[PDB]
Amino acid sequence: APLSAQELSQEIKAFLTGVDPILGHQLSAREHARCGLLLLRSLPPARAAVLDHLRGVFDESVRAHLAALDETGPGLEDVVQEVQQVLSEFIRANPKAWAPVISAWSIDLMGQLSSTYSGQHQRVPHATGALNELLQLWMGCRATRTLMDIYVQCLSALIGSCPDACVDALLDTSVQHSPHFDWVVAHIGSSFPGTIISRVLSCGLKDFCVHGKIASVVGILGHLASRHGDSIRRELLRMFHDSVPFLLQLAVMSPALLGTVSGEL
């Protein structure tokens, strides 16, 4: 939106320094987040600290929600949907400049929350067969659902422009933030079975070839997601036979994945 060219120095000083000088107090995360959104509207080069402040806001909101739920001021969830609206307005107004960076910041903070609140919080179900519990419980925290909605917008924008690197970044984060974040990859594969299960098969084959349990978690996630969508695995097996036994090992470790093996057999 338009703004006077002289107010930017004081506004940016207020946001970045943390302490608001014109008001003479430390503002809450909500007003700072709104100021950062306004700065994104006005000054694109001022995005550097905005993403970090957004990360802090989301992390604190998730921590408050966990305190409200894992042990079961108030929850700060009311500002989260506002951030969703504003970021989606940027995404739909212009997919080119907003789709990759917002998605990267978001997936990185999901990796942070997955590493931070798994194992440290014992009540959080680990990715050890409690994948369905992982999908159910995390929507109790509204921030996660919000981020998945953001990803629906981001992935639609990428599909419109160029859907190539999003899956690569997702798998790279799955490897790095293993095994706690991979439930997001499982849900993503549930939304898009074909491409995601193909890349899961590819990365699992790389893992098996280099080794001779991230691949096991990937296979479990694929088996959970693939409801009559294992034909890609059969096609991959046929192609590998045309010109490799990682699928056999995955089926051995994943009986549900082998549930359709008999029909395929």
């Binding site: 994104l40 006005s42 000054l43 694109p44 001022a46 550097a48």
Partner: protein, 372 residues
């Protein structure tokens, strides 16, 4: 300076940038009066790179603090210092590295930081930086300056929805920057992509420039004689013929090889071309009795020939039936601009220069009549 950069990089919490600005001001205090043009000093280049790009004199050196938020705070403090420095030396040292080459190993990161800092300074109402930006293209490379200005304009308008009005207000308050942005707009209006077609905000900015930046163009024309094919960049803000030819041929060239954006905006493109032609005619009328010199006459510097070649390239494939009117309009607009420029008395040849240049122009009844 590596040592000065390292010394000034400490205390990134609104203190590193202040120290760097103070050191740069101390070093270039004489430079502020000797020649405060848009040039990059190699002494403060390392300090600017370290305190903004998070990259010291060595390209692979450790970044200043943790960057990001600290880097943003340093950028804000540096912008506040430069805007209130009351000297063009500091702003020029900070921002000029974006497009003007510096011959440094870390010159790419320094250029990115300088571009971000110049965008912030323009948005932070740093008049000296914007004013020197006009002089930046006068002697440095014009392609790099055009690319940097186009990137800044796109970030202000395309990436930031609604901030284009602030950019137009700054351009009105900094007419030197607005005049220097005409060449960047012409370079970015090649009609080779959807972004090349100006948006509604771009149209509003063009209208604002036509209303106000024409005075800056006249002032620049009075500052130095209108040279024909100047060194590497003149920044005279007189790319009217090429812009008109591109805009009129947008529904033809774009359709030939996005296409829908220029095709559906035929009325808007025609209106923008008419406004640009009116602004150019008004500027020529103002710079008619004034000592605008001869020789060159029309403001082409062989850009009219490139526009004619671009039109003719698409004039043979799919143009004759689908968009013959667009090609005819582009040729007529170019010829009309040439004639109106000659109407100011600069072009002292009714048909000598016309036979030299317009003889190779494409076929058009209006253009042929205007030429002859």
């Amino acid at each position: 300076m590596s040592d000065i950069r390292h010394s000034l990089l400490r205390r990134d919490a609104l203190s590193a940038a202040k120290e760097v600005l103070y050191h740069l001001d101390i070093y270039f205090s004489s430079q502020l009066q000797s020649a405060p043009l848009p040039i990059v000093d190699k002494g403060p280049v390392e300090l600017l790179e370290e305190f903004v790009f998070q990259v010291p004199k060595e390209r692979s050196a450790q970044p200043k603090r943790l960057n990001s938020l600290q880097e943003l705070q340093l950028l804000e403090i540096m912008c506040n210092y430069f805007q209130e420095q009351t000297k063009d030396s500091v702003r020029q040292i900070i921002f000029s590295s974006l497009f003007s080459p510096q011959g440094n190993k870390a010159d790419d990161s320094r250029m990115s930081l300088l571009g971000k800092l110049v965008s912030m300074a323009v948005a932070v109402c740093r008049i000296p930086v914007l004013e020197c930006a006009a002089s930046w293209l006068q002697r440095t490379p014009v392609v790099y300056c055009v690319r940097l200005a186009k990137a800044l304009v796109d970030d202000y308008c395309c990436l930031v929805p609604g901030s284009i009005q602030t950019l137009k207000q700054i351009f009105s308050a900094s007419p030197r920057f607005c005049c220097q942005f005409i060449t960047s707009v012409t370079a970015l209006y090649d009609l080779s992509s959807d972004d090349l077609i100006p948006p509604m905000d771009l149209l509003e900015m063009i209208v604002t420039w036509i209303f106000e930046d024409p005075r800056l163009i006249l002032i620049t024309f009075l500052n130095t004689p209108i040279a024909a094919n100047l060194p590497i960049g003149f920044l005279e803000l007189t790319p009217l013929v090429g812009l008109i030819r591109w805009c009129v041929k947008a529904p033809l060239a774009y359709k030939r090889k996005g296409v829908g954006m220029d095709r559906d905006s035929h009325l808007l493109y025609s209106k923008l071309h008419l406004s640009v032609l009116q602004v150019l005619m008004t500027l020529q009328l103002h710079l008619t009795e004034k000592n605008l010199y001869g020789r060159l006459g029309l403001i082409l510097f062989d850009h009219m020939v490139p526009l004619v070649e671009e039109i003719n390239r698409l004039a043979d494939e799919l143009n004759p039936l689908n968009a013959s009117q667009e090609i005819e309009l582009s040729l007529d607009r170019l010829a009309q601009a040439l004639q109106v420029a000659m109407a100011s008395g600069a072009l002292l040849c009714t048909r000598d220069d016309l036979r030299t240049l317009c003889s190779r122009l494409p076929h058009n009844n209006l253009l042929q009549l205007v030429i002859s």
